[PDB]
């Protein structure tokens, strides 16, 4: 994988159409767009998410467990790899799958309540402490690996847990068997165990992803690259591992690429403070020897409303941020999401700051 890495992060929800001929034209336009961009890598959505409801009910590949909305992942992948000149990473949820109801869901323990619950504002995650969950998610990854060819796996940012999670029974048993003492509420507020507990959960998530990676590699070979999305707070504010169960140093050690969600508006940063926020983030990375060499800075090309009516970020703004990264010594970056239907971001405005091939 020759450097710098320049990544387009792409949803196939945009490509899908009930009319097959329209879908064909859509795929053709997408392939040409990526070819024209002249960058290195596409992170390609393997699951359907038309509603942004934080739960995958259908996917883009044949498989044993979930409905296939359309057989298009493998078709788009091989064309991008041979016509558009890019590596392809299959972008897959780690936990947020709409599987058999008897599979354990991640739960949290509400303050002042005795029974654990599922928080409506989080990804609808299955518990990584349930071995049946590990097996069935494993099956989905094996099914993708069997039917499509690709160069890497991008593990979704839904591999996270808060400081009130996971409160489910198998998680409780796992903590007990690992030597943790007391209820979840006692552990999280125990000065002598709460840090160990956060790290235990971070390692549990990472180990689960490495298990999934091993299953794919058994099928497609050892050459498969791994990437995982990490939230910005665990990078800039490491104590936040306590409520993310993500550890930046761990990601750097465990994956070929750590894809940092360098998205200031997502993080609630004001428009006039976003540049400084990005400079602070990149300064933090550069202070960790060779972190920049294994990290991708992923910029946002939309401003999301937890409601659902997302707003585009201007092409000029995105190009400005890409320029900012380069001027601050960062060579590996990309953006999410791409919208081929509307040329958003505008390829002519983005290319000179994004493609090394630009003249
Ligand atoms: C006094 C004061 O206000 N200062 C505190 C300071 O002590 C502390 O740093 C922060 C955070 O405290 C910890 O917050 C944990 C998370 O709280 C939940 O955050 C939800 C929003 O999360 C954001 O989500 C976006 C993605 O959509 C992500 O990009 C972003 O980084 C996230 N932000 C953070 C900070 O994580 C929010 O909607 C939830 O309501 C909120 N839930 C709760 C229970 O607060 C929390 O789980 C920790 O317990 C809490 N513990 C500490 C810091 O002791 O808060 C400052 O205000």
Swiss-Prot record:
User: Which GO biological process annotations does it have?
Assistant: carbohydrate metabolic process; cell adhesion involved in biofilm formation; macromolecule deacylation; single-species biofilm formation
Membrane topology according to the record: Lipid-anchor
In the Enzyme Commission scheme, what number(s) does this protein have? 3.5.1.-
Question: Molecular function terms in GO for this entry?
Answer: hydrolase activity; hydrolase activity, acting on carbon-nitrogen (but not peptide) bonds; hydrolase activity, hydrolyzing O-glycosyl compounds
* Primary localization class, coarse: membrane
Q: What happens when the gene is disrupted?
A: Deletion of pgaB does not prevent PGA synthesis but does block its export and biofilm formation. The synthesized PGA is retained in the periplasm and accumulates at the cell poles.
Q: Does the keyword GTP-binding apply?
A: no
Q: Name one GO cellular component term.
A: cell outer membrane
Tell me where it resides.
Cell outer membrane
- What keywords is this UniProt entry annotated with? Cell outer membrane, Hydrolase, Lipoprotein, Membrane, Palmitate, Signal
What family does the Swiss-Prot or TrEMBL record give for this protein?
A: Belongs to the polysaccharide deacetylase family.
What does UniProt say about this protein's domains?
Answer: Contains a N-terminal polysaccharide deacetylase domain, and a C-terminal domain required for PGA N-deacetylation that may be involved in binding to unmodified poly-beta-1,6-GlcNAc and thereby assists catalysis by the deacetylase domain.
Q: What does this protein do?
A: Catalyzes the N-deacetylation of poly-beta-1,6-N-acetyl-D-glucosamine (PGA), a biofilm adhesin polysaccharide. N-deacetylation promotes PGA export through the PgaA porin.
Protein name per the record = Poly-beta-1,6-N-acetyl-D-glucosamine N-deacetylase
- Which organism was this protein described from? Escherichia coli (strain K12)
